[PDB]
Amino acid sequence: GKILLLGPERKWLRDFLESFEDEVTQYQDKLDKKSAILNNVDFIISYGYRYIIHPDIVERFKQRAINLHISYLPWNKGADPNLWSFLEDSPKGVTIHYIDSGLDTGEIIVQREVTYYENDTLRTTYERLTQTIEKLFMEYWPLIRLGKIRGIPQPKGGSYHKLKDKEKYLYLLTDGWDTPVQKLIGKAQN
Ligand SMILES: CC(=O)N[C@H]1[C@@H](OP(=O)(O)OP(=O)(O)OC[C@H]2O[C@@H](n3ccc(=O)[nH]c3=O)[C@H](O)[C@@H]2O)O[C@@H](C)[C@H](N)[C@@H]1O
């Protein structure tokens, strides 16, 4: 098969996908719906892609497109999920889901709660989320690749953010991603 990776190039992920004897191409810029990049692609994986996939592409790749999203869906769809999970004191974790129209709303394939600890920062929690989802993907991709797996419908509810929603809270992040999370818990509530 031919896999299209949307998002940044990552050596471990290229090597993993290629170990199954699949053909792997990667792209991280805006993807026009008639682009030849999609010619003969059999499966789409997005991880870290910063553009919304065109609906015509989504429908064309029904049940052949997944997204690796570092939130516990349905909470924190969209942008900066790790940050919002502390600002809004929400469930924390990672989710692999089929891509459907709209913004991180598709069927859940598997998810995992990720805990945080005393002294964690936005950096340490983000890196933990990242390790969790990458191992989870490695565990499940053998099944996903063979269509040996289906999802369950993602419940409506949870939450959704856009990039600009965090602007009024940036002043709390005095150490950038090294800001301790304890300082942020629930700051967007009340
Ligand atoms: C709006 C958008 O398009 N988002 C991308 C993606 O973005 P991302 O790939 O995860 O990078 P982000 O911009 O969040 O961070 C860049 C770097 O800053 C560091 N960092 C950041 C935040 C944090 O809490 N702690 C921390 O340490 C770390 O090194 C990280 O790599 O997020 C996905 C969930 C979206 N599905 C989408 O794909």
Coordinates of C-alpha atoms and ligand atoms in Angstrom, one line a residue:
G1 CA 0.0 0.0 0.0
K2 CA 0.8 3.7 -0.2
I3 CA 0.6 5.8 3.0
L4 CA 0.5 9.6 3.0
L5 CA 1.8 11.1 6.3
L6 CA 0.4 14.6 6.8
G7 CA 2.5 16.5 9.3
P8 CA 6.2 16.8 10.0
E9 CA 8.7 14.2 8.9
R10 CA 9.6 11.9 11.8
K11 CA 12.3 9.2 11.2
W12 CA 10.9 6.7 13.8
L13 CA 7.5 6.9 12.1
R14 CA 8.8 6.6 8.6
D15 CA 10.9 3.6 9.5
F16 CA 7.9 2.0 11.4
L17 CA 5.5 2.4 8.5
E18 CA 8.1 1.3 5.9
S19 CA 8.9 -1.8 8.0
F20 CA 5.5 -3.1 6.9
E21 CA 6.7 -2.9 3.2
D22 CA 4.3 0.0 2.6
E23 CA 5.3 3.0 0.4
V24 CA 5.4 6.2 2.5
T25 CA 5.1 9.8 1.4
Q26 CA 5.0 12.8 3.7
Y27 CA 3.7 16.3 3.3
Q28 CA 3.1 19.2 5.7
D29 CA 1.9 22.1 3.5
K30 CA -1.6 23.0 2.3
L31 CA -3.1 20.1 0.3
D32 CA -5.3 21.1 -2.7
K33 CA -8.1 18.6 -3.3
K34 CA -6.9 17.8 -6.9
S35 CA -3.2 17.5 -5.9
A36 CA -1.4 14.6 -7.5
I37 CA 0.1 13.9 -4.1
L38 CA -3.1 11.9 -3.4
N39 CA -2.8 9.9 -6.7
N40 CA -3.0 6.2 -5.7
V41 CA -2.7 6.9 -2.0
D42 CA -4.4 4.1 0.0
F43 CA -4.3 5.5 3.5
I44 CA -3.8 8.9 5.2
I45 CA -2.3 9.4 8.7
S46 CA -2.2 12.9 10.1
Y47 CA -0.1 13.7 13.1
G48 CA 0.9 17.3 13.7
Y49 CA -0.7 18.6 10.5
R50 CA -1.5 22.3 10.7
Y51 CA -4.1 22.7 8.0
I52 CA -7.6 21.4 7.9
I53 CA -8.0 18.6 5.3
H54 CA -10.4 19.5 2.5
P55 CA -13.9 17.8 2.9
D56 CA -13.7 16.3 -0.5
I57 CA -10.5 14.5 0.5
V58 CA -12.1 13.4 3.8
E59 CA -15.0 11.8 2.0
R60 CA -12.7 10.3 -0.6
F61 CA -10.8 8.6 2.2
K62 CA -13.6 7.5 4.5
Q63 CA -12.3 4.8 6.7
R64 CA -8.8 5.2 5.2
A65 CA -7.7 8.3 7.1
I66 CA -6.8 8.6 10.8
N67 CA -5.5 11.4 13.1
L68 CA -3.2 11.1 16.1
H69 CA -4.6 13.8 18.5
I70 CA -3.1 14.3 21.9
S71 CA -6.3 15.0 23.8
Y72 CA -8.9 12.7 25.5
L73 CA -11.6 13.2 22.9
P74 CA -14.3 14.6 23.0
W75 CA -12.4 17.0 25.2
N76 CA -10.0 19.6 23.7
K77 CA -10.7 19.1 20.0
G78 CA -8.7 21.6 18.0
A79 CA -5.7 23.7 19.2
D80 CA -3.4 23.6 22.2
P81 CA -5.1 20.6 23.8
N82 CA -2.5 20.1 26.5
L83 CA -2.8 23.7 27.7
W84 CA -6.6 23.7 27.7
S85 CA -6.7 20.4 29.6
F86 CA -5.2 22.3 32.5
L87 CA -6.9 25.7 32.0
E88 CA -10.3 24.0 31.9
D89 CA -9.3 21.1 34.2
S90 CA -10.5 18.4 31.8
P91 CA -9.7 14.8 31.1
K92 CA -6.1 14.4 29.8
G93 CA -5.0 11.8 27.3
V94 CA -4.5 10.8 23.7
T95 CA -6.8 9.5 21.0
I96 CA -6.5 7.8 17.6
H97 CA -9.6 8.5 15.6
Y98 CA -10.9 8.3 12.0
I99 CA -11.0 11.6 10.2
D100 CA -14.5 12.8 9.4
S101 CA -15.6 16.2 8.1
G102 CA -15.1 18.8 10.8
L103 CA -12.5 19.4 13.4
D104 CA -11.3 16.3 15.3
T105 CA -14.9 14.9 15.5
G106 CA -14.5 11.5 13.9
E107 CA -14.9 8.0 15.3
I108 CA -12.7 6.9 18.2
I109 CA -10.4 3.9 17.5
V110 CA -8.6 3.8 20.8
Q111 CA -7.7 6.3 23.6
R112 CA -5.7 6.4 26.7
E113 CA -5.8 8.6 29.8
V114 CA -2.5 10.3 30.6
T115 CA -1.9 11.3 34.2
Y116 CA 0.2 14.2 35.5
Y117 CA 2.2 14.6 38.7
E118 CA 3.6 17.0 41.2
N119 CA 5.9 19.5 39.5
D120 CA 4.9 18.8 35.9
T121 CA 5.2 21.6 33.4
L122 CA 3.5 22.1 30.1
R123 CA 6.7 20.6 28.5
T124 CA 6.8 17.4 30.6
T125 CA 3.1 16.7 30.2
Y126 CA 3.2 17.4 26.4
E127 CA 6.2 15.1 26.0
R128 CA 4.4 12.4 28.0
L129 CA 1.3 12.8 25.8
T130 CA 3.6 12.5 22.8
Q131 CA 5.2 9.3 24.0
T132 CA 1.9 7.7 24.9
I133 CA 0.2 8.3 21.6
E134 CA 3.3 7.2 19.6
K135 CA 3.4 3.9 21.5
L136 CA -0.4 3.5 21.2
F137 CA -0.1 4.0 17.4
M138 CA 2.6 1.4 17.1
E139 CA 0.4 -1.1 19.0
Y140 CA -2.7 -0.5 16.9
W141 CA -1.4 0.4 13.4
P142 CA -0.9 -3.4 12.6
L143 CA -4.7 -3.8 13.1
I144 CA -5.7 -0.5 11.5
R145 CA -3.6 -1.2 8.4
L146 CA -5.5 -4.5 7.8
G147 CA -8.9 -2.9 8.3
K148 CA -9.1 -5.3 11.3
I149 CA -10.5 -2.5 13.4
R150 CA -13.5 -0.2 13.6
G151 CA -14.3 2.7 15.8
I152 CA -17.1 3.8 18.0
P153 CA -18.9 7.2 17.4
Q154 CA -17.2 10.0 19.2
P155 CA -19.7 11.5 21.6
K156 CA -20.7 15.1 21.0
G157 CA -19.8 17.4 23.8
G158 CA -16.3 17.7 25.3
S159 CA -14.8 21.0 24.1
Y160 CA -13.1 22.7 21.2
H161 CA -10.6 25.5 20.9
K162 CA -9.0 27.7 18.2
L163 CA -5.4 28.9 18.3
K164 CA -6.5 32.4 19.3
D165 CA -8.5 31.3 22.3
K166 CA -5.4 31.1 24.5
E167 CA -4.4 34.7 24.0
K168 CA -5.9 36.1 27.2
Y169 CA -4.0 33.4 29.2
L170 CA -0.5 33.7 27.7
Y171 CA 0.5 36.0 30.6
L172 CA 0.2 33.0 33.0
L173 CA 2.9 31.2 31.0
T174 CA 5.8 33.1 32.5
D175 CA 8.3 30.2 31.8
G176 CA 6.9 29.3 28.4
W177 CA 6.3 25.6 28.1
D178 CA 8.3 25.2 31.4
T179 CA 5.5 26.8 33.2
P180 CA 4.4 24.4 36.0
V181 CA 0.9 23.2 35.3
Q182 CA -0.3 23.6 38.9
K183 CA -0.2 27.3 38.4
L184 CA -2.7 27.0 35.5
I185 CA -5.3 24.5 36.7
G186 CA -8.8 25.9 36.3
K187 CA -7.6 29.4 35.4
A188 CA -10.1 29.6 32.5
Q189 CA -13.0 28.7 34.7
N190 CA -15.2 31.2 36.7
Ligands
LIG1 C1 -3.1 24.3 15.9 C2 -2.4 23.1 15.2 O1 -2.3 23.0 14.0 N1 -1.9 22.1 16.1 C3 -1.3 20.8 15.5 C4 -0.5 20.2 16.7 O2 0.4 21.1 17.1 P1 1.7 20.4 17.7 O3 2.4 19.6 16.6 O4 1.4 19.4 18.9 O5 2.8 21.5 18.2 P2 2.4 22.8 19.1 O6 2.3 24.0 18.2 O7 1.2 22.5 20.1 O8 3.8 22.8 19.9 C5 5.1 23.0 19.3 C6 6.1 22.6 20.3 O9 6.0 23.3 21.4 C7 6.2 22.4 22.6 N2 5.1 22.4 23.4 C8 3.8 22.8 22.9 C9 2.6 22.8 23.8 C10 2.8 22.3 25.2 O10 1.9 22.2 25.9 N3 4.1 21.8 25.6 C11 5.3 21.8 24.8 O11 6.3 21.4 25.2 C12 6.6 21.0 22.0 O12 8.0 20.8 21.8 C13 5.9 21.1 20.9 O13 6.4 20.1 19.9 O14 -1.4 19.9 17.8 C14 -2.3 18.9 17.3 C15 -3.1 18.4 18.5 C16 -3.2 19.5 16.2 N4 -4.0 18.3 15.8 C17 -2.4 20.0 15.1 O15 -1.9 18.8 14.3

